[PDB]
Short mmCIF file of N, CA, C and O in Angstrom, two decimals:
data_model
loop_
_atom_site.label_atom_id
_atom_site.label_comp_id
_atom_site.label_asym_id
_atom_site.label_seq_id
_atom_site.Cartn_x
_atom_site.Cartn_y
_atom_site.Cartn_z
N UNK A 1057 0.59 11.60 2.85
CA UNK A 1057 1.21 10.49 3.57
C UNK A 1057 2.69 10.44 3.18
O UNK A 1057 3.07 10.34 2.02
N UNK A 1058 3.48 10.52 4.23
CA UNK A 1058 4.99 9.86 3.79
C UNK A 1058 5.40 9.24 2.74
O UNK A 1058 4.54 8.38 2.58
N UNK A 1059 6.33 9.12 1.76
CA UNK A 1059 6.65 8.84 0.80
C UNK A 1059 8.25 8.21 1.72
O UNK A 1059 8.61 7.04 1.54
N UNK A 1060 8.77 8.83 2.34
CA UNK A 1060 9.83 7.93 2.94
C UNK A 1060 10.11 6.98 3.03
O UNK A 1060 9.13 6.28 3.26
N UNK A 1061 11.75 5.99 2.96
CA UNK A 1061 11.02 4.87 3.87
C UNK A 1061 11.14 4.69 5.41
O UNK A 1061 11.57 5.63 6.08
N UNK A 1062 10.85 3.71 5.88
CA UNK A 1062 10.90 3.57 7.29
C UNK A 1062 11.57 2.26 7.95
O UNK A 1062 11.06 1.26 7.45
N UNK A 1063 12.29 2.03 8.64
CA UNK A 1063 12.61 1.05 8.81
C UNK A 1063 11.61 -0.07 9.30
O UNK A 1063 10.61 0.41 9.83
N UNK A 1064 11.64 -1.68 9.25
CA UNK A 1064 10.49 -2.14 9.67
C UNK A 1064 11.70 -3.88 10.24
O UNK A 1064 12.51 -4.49 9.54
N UNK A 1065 11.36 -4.10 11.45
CA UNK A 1065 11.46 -5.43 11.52
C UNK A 1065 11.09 -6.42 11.12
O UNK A 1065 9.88 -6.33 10.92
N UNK A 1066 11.70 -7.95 10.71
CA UNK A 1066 10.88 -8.79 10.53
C UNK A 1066 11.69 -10.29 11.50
O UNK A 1066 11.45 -11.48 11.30
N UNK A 1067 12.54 -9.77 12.40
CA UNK A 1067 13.18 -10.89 13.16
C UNK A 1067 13.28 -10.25 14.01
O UNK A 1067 13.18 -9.03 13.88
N UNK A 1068 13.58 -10.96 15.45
CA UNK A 1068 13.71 -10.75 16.53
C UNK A 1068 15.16 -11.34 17.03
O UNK A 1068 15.47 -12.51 16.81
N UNK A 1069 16.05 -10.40 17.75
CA UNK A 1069 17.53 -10.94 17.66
C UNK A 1069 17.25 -12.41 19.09
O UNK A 1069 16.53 -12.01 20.01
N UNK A 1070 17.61 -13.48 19.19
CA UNK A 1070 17.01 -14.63 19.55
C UNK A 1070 17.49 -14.58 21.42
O UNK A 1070 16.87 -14.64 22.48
N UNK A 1071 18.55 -14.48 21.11
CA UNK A 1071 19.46 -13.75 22.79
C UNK A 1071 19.91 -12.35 23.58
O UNK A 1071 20.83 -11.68 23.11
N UNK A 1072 19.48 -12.09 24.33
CA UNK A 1072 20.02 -10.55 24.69
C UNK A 1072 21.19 -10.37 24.32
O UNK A 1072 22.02 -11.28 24.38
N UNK A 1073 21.50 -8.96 23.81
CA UNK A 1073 22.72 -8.13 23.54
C UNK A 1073 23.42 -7.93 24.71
O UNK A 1073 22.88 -7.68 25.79
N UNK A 1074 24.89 -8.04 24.48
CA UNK A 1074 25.36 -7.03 25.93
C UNK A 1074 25.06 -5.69 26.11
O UNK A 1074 25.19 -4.73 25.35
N UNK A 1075 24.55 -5.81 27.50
CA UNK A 1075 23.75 -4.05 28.02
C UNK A 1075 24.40 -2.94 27.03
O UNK A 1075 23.91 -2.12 26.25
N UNK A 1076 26.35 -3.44 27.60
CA UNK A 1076 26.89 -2.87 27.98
C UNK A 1076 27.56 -1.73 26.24
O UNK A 1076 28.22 -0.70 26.16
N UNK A 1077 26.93 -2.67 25.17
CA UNK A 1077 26.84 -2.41 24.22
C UNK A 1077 26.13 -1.74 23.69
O UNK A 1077 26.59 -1.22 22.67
N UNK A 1078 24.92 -1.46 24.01
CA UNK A 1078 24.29 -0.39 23.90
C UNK A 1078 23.88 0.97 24.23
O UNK A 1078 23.85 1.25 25.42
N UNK A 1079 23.55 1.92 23.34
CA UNK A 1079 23.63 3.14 23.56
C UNK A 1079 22.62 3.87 23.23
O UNK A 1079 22.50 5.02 23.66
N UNK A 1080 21.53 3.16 22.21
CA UNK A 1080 20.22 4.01 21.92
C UNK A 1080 19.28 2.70 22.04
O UNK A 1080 19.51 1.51 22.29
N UNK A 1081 17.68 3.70 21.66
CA UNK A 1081 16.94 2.29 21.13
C UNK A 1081 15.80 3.48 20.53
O UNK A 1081 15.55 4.58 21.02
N UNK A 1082 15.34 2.96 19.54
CA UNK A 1082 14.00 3.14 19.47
C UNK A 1082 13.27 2.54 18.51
O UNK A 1082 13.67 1.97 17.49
N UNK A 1083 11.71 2.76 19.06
CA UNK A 1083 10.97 1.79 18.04
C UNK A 1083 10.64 2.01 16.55
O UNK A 1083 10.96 2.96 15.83
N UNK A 1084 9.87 0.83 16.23
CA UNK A 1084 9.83 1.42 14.49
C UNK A 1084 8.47 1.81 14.75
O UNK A 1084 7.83 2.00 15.78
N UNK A 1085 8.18 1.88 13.37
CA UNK A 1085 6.64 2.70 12.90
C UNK A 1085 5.56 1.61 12.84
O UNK A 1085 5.64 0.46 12.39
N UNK A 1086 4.58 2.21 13.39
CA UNK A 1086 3.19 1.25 14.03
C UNK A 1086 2.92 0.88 12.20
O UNK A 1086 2.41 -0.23 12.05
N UNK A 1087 3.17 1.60 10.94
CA UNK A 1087 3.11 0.78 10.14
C UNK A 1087 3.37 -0.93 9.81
O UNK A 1087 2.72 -1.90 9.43
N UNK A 1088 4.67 -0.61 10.21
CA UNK A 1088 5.32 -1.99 9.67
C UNK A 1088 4.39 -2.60 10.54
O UNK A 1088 4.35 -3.82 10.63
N UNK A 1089 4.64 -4.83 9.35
CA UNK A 1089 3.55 -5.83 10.06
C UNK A 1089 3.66 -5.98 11.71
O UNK A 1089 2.69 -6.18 12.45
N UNK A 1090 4.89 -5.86 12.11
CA UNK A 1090 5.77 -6.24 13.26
C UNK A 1090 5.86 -4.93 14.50
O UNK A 1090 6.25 -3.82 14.15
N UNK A 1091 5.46 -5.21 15.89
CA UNK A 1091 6.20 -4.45 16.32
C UNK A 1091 7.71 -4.83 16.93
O UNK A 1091 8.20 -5.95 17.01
N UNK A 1092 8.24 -3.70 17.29
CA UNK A 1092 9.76 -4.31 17.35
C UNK A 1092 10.58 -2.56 17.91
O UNK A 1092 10.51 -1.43 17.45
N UNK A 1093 11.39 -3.24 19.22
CA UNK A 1093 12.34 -2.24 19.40
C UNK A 1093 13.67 -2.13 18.62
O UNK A 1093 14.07 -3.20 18.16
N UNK A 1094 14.15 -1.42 18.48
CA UNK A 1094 15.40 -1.41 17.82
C UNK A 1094 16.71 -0.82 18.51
O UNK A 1094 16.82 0.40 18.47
N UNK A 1095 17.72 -1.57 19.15
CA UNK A 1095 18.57 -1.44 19.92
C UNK A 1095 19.96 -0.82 18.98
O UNK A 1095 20.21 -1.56 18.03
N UNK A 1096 20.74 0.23 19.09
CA UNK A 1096 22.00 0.77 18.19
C UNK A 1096 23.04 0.88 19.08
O UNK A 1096 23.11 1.68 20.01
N UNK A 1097 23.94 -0.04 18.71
CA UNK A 1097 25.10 -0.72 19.00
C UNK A 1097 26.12 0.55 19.28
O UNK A 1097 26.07 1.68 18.78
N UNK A 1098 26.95 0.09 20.13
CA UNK A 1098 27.92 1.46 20.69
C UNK A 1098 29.10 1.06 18.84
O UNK A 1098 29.77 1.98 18.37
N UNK A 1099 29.09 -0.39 18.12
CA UNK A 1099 29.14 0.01 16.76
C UNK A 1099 28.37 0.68 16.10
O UNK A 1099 28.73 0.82 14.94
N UNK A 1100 27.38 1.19 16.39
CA UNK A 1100 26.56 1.77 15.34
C UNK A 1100 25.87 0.66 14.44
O UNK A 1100 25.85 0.80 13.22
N UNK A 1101 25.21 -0.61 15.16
CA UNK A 1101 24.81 -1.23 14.63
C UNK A 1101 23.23 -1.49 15.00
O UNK A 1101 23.14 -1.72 16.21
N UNK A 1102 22.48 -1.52 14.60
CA UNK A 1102 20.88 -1.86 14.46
C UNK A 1102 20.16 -2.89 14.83
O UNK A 1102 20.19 -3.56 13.80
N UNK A 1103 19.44 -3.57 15.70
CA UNK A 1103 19.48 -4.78 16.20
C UNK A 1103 18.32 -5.16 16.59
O UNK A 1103 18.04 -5.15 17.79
N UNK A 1104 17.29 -5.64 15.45
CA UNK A 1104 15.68 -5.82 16.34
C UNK A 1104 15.67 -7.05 17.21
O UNK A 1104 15.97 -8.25 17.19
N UNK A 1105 15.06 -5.91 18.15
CA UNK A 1105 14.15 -6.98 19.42
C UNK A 1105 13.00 -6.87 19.46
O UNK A 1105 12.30 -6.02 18.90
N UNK A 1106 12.55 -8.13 20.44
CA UNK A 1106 11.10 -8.22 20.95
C UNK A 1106 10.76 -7.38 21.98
O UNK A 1106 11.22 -7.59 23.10
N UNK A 1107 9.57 -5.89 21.64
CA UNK A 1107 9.39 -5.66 23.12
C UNK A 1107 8.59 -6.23 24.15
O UNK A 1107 8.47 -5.63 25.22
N UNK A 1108 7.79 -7.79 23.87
CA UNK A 1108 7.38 -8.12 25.07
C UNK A 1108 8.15 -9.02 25.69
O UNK A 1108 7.65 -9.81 26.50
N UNK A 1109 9.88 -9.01 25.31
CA UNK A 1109 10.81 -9.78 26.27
C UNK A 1109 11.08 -9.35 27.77
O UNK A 1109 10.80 -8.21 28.13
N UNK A 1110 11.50 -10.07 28.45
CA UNK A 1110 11.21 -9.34 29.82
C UNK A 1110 13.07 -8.98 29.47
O UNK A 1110 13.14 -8.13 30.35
N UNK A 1111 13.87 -9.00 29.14
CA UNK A 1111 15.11 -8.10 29.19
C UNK A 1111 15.17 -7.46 28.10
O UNK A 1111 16.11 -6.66 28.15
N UNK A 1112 14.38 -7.40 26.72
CA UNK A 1112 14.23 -6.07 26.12
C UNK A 1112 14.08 -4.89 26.93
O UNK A 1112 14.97 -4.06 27.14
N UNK A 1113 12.48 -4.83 27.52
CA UNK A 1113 11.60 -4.04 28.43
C UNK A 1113 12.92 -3.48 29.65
O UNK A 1113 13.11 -2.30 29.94
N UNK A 1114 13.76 -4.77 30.26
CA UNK A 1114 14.74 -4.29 31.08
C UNK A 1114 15.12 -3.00 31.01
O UNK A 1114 14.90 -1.99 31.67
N UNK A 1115 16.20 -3.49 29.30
CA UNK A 1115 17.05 -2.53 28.87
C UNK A 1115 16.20 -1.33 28.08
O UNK A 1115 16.91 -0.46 27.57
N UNK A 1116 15.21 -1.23 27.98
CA UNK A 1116 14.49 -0.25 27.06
C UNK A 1116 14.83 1.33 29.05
O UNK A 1116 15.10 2.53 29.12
N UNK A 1117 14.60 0.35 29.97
CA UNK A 1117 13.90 1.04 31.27
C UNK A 1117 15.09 1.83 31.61
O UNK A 1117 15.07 3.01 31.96
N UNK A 1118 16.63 0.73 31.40
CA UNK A 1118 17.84 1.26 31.90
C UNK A 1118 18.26 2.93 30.96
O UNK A 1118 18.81 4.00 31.22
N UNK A 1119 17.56 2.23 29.75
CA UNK A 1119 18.33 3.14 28.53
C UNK A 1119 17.72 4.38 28.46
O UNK A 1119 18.17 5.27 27.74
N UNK A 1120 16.30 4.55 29.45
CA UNK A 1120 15.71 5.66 29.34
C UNK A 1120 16.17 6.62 30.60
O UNK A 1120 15.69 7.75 30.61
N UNK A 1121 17.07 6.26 31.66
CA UNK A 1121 17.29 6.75 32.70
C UNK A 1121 18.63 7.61 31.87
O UNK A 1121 19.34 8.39 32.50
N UNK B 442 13.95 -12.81 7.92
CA UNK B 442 14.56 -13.67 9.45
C UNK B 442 16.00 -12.85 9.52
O UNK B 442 16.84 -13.68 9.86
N UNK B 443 16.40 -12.02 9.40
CA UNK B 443 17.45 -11.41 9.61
C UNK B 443 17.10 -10.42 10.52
O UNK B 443 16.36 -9.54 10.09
N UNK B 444 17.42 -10.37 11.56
CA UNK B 444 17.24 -9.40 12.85
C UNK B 444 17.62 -7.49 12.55
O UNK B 444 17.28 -6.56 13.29
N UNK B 445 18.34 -7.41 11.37
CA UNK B 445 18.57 -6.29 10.89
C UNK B 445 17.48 -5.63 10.24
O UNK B 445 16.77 -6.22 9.41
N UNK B 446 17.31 -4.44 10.57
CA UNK B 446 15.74 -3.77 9.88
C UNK B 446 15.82 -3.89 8.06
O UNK B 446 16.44 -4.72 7.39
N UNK B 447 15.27 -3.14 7.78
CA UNK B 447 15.25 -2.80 6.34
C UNK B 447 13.83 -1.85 5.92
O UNK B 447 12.72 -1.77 6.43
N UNK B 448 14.40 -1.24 4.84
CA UNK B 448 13.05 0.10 4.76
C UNK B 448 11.88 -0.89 3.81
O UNK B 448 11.94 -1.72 2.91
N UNK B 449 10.90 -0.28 4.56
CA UNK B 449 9.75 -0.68 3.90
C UNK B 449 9.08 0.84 3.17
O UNK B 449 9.58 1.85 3.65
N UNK B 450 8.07 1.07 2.14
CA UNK B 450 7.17 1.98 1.99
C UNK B 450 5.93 2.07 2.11
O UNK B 450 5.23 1.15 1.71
N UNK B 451 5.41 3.15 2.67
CA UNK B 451 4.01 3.05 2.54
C UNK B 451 3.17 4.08 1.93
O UNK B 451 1.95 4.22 2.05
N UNK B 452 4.22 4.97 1.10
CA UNK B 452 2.90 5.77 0.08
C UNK B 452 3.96 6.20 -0.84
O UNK B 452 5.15 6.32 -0.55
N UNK B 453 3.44 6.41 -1.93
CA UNK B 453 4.36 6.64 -2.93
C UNK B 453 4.27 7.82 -3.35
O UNK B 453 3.20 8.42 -3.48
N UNK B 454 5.64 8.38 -3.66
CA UNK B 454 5.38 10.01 -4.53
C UNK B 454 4.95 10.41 -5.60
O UNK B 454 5.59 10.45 -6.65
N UNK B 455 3.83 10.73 -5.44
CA UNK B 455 2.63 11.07 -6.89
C UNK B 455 3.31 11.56 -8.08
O UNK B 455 3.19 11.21 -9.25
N UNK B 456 4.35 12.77 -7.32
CA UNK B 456 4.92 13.09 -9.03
C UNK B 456 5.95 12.64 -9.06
O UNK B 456 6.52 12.12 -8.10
N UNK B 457 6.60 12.81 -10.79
CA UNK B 457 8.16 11.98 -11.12
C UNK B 457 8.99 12.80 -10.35
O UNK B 457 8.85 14.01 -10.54
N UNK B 458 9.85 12.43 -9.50
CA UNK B 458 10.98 13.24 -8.94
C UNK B 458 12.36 13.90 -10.33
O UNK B 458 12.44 13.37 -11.44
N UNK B 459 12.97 14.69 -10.03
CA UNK B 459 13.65 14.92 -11.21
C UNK B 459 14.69 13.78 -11.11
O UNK B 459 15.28 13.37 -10.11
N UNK B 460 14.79 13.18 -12.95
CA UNK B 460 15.81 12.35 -13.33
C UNK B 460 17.38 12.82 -12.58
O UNK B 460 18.30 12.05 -12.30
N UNK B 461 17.35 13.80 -12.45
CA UNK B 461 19.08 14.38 -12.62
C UNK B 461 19.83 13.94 -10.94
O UNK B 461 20.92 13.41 -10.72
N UNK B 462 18.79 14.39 -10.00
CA UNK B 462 18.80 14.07 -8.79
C UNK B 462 18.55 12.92 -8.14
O UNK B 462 18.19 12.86 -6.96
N UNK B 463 18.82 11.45 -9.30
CA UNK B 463 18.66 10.20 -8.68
C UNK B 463 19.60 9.95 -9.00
O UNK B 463 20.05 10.26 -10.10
N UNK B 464 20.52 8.94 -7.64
CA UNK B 464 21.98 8.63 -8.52
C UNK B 464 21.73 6.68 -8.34
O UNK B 464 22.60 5.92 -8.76
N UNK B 465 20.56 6.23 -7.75
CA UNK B 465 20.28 4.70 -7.74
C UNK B 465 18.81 4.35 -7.44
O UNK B 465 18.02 5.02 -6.78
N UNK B 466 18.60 3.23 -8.04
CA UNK B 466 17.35 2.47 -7.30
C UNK B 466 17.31 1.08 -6.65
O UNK B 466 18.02 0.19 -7.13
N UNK B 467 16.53 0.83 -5.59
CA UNK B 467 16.30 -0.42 -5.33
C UNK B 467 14.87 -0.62 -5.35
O UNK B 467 14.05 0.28 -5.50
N UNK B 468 14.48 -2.43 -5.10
CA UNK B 468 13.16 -2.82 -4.88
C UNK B 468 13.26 -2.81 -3.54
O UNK B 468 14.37 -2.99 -3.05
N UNK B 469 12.16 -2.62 -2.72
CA UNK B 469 11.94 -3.11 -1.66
C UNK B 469 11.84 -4.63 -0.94
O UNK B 469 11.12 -5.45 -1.50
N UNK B 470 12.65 -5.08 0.47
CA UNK B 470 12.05 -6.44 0.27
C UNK B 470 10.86 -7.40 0.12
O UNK B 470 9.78 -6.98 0.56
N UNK B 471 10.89 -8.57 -0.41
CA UNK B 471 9.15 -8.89 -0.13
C UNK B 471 8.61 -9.26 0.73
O UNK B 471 7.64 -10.01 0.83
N UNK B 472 9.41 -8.57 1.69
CA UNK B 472 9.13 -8.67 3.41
C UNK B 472 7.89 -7.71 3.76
O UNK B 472 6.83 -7.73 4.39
N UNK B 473 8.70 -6.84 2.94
CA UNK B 473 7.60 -5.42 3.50
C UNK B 473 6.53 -5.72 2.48
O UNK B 473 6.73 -6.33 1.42
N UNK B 474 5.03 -5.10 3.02
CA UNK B 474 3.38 -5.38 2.74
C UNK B 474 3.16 -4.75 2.16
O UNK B 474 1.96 -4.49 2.22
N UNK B 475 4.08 -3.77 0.95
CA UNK B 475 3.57 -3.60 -0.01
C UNK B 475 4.97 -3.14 -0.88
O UNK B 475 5.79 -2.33 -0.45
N UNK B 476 5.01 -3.53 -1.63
CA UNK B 476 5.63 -3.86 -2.92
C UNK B 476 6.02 -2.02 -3.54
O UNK B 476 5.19 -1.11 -3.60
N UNK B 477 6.97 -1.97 -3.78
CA UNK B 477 7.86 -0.31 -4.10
C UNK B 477 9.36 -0.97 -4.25
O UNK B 477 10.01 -1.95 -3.91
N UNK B 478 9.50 0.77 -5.33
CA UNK B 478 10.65 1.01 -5.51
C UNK B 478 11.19 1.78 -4.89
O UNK B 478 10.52 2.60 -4.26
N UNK B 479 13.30 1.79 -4.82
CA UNK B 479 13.06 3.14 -3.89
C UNK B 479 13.83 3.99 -4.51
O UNK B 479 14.99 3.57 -4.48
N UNK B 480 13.72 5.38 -5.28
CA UNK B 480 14.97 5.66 -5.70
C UNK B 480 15.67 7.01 -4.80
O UNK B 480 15.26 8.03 -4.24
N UNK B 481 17.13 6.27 -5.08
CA UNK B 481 17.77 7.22 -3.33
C UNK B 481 18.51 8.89 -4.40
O UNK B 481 19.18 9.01 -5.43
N UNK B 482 18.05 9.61 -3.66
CA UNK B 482 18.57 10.55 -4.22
C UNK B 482 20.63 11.08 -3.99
O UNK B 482 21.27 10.67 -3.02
N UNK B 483 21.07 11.72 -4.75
CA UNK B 483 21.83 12.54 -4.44
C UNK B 483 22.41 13.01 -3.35
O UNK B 483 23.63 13.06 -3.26
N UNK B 484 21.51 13.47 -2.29
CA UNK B 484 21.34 13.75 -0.91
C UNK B 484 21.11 12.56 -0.20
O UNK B 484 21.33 12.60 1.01
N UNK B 485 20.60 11.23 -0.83
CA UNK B 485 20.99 9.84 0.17
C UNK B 485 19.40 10.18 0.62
O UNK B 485 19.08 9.81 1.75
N UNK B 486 18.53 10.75 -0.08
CA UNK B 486 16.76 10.52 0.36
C UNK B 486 16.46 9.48 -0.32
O UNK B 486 17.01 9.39 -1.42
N UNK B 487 15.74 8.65 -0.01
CA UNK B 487 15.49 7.02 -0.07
C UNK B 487 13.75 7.63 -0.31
O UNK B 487 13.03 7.91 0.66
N UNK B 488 13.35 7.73 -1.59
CA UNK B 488 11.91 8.08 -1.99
C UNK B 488 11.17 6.49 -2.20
O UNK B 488 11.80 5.45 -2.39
N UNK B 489 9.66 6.64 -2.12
CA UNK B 489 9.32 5.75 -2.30
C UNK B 489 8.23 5.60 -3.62
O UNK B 489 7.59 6.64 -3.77
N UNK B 490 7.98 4.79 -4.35
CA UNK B 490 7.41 4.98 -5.79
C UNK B 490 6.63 3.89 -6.13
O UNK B 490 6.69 2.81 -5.53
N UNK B 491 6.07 4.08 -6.85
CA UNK B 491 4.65 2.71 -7.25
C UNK B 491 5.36 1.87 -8.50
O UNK B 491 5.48 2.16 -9.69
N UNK B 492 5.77 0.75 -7.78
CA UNK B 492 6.42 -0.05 -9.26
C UNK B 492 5.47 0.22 -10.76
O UNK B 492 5.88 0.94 -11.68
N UNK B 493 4.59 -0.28 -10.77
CA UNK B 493 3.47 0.01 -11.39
C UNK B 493 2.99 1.29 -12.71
O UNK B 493 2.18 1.47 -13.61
N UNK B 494 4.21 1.95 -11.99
CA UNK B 494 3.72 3.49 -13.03
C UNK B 494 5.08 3.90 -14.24
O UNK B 494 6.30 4.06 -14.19
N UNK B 495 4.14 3.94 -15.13
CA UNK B 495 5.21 4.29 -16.40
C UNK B 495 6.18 5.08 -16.10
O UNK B 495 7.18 4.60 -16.65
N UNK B 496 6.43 5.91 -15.61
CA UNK B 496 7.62 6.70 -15.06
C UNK B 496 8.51 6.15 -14.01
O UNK B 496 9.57 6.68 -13.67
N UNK B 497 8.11 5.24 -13.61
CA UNK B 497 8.64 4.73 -12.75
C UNK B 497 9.97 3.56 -13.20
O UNK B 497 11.10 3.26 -12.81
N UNK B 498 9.02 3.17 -14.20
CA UNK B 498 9.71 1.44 -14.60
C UNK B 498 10.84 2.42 -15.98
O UNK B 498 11.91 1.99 -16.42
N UNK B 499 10.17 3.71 -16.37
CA UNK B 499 11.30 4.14 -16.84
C UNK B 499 12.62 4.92 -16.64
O UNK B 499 13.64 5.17 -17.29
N UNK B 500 12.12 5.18 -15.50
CA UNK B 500 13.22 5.16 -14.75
C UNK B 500 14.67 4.46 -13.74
O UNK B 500 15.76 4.79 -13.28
N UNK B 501 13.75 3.34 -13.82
CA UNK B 501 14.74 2.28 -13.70
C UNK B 501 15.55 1.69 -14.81
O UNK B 501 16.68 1.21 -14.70
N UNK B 502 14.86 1.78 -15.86
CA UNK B 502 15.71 0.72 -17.18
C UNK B 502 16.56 2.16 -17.46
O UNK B 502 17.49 1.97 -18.24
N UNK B 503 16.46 3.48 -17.02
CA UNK B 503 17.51 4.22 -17.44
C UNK B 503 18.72 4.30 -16.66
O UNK B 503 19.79 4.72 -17.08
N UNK B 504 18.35 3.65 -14.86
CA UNK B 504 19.40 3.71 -13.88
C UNK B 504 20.31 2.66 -14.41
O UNK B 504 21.53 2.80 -14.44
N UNK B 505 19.49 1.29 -14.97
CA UNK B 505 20.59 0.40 -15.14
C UNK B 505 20.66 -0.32 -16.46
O UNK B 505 21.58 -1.10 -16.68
#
């Protein structure tokens, strides 16, 4: 088993991000208690969300095109 | 409650990693569901370790 660590959420950012700010996403590990997408900032910043928000899910749809 | 991730562990490395190749340690938060140390190597590898084990805890009182 992994000895790594992994990143894990434990908050959900409360308001959508600007779209226009983002540039990646992906989720964490079905380990952690939480699930949670993780949005990375055109800063290079890290940003958990909820994926059963209906504009997480939005931007998860835009970000995969 | 901070929307920023943070590493959690979930299995620890059975053997002592070498002393020479750790340049820090942290605890994990007590966010994450199970309780570890982490010590980051040289190369910036973030290992994960069983607070619990004599090599372990002596390796921390030698980091700091």
């Amino acid at each position: 088993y992994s000895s790594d660590t992994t990143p894990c959420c434990f908050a959900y950012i409360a308001r959508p991000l600007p779209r226009a700010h983002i540039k990646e996403y992906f989720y964490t590990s079905g380990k952690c208690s939480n699930p949670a997408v993780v949005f990375v900032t055109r800063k290079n910043r890290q940003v958990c969300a909820n994926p059963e928000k209906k504009w997480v899910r939005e931007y998860i749809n835009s970000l995969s095109m």
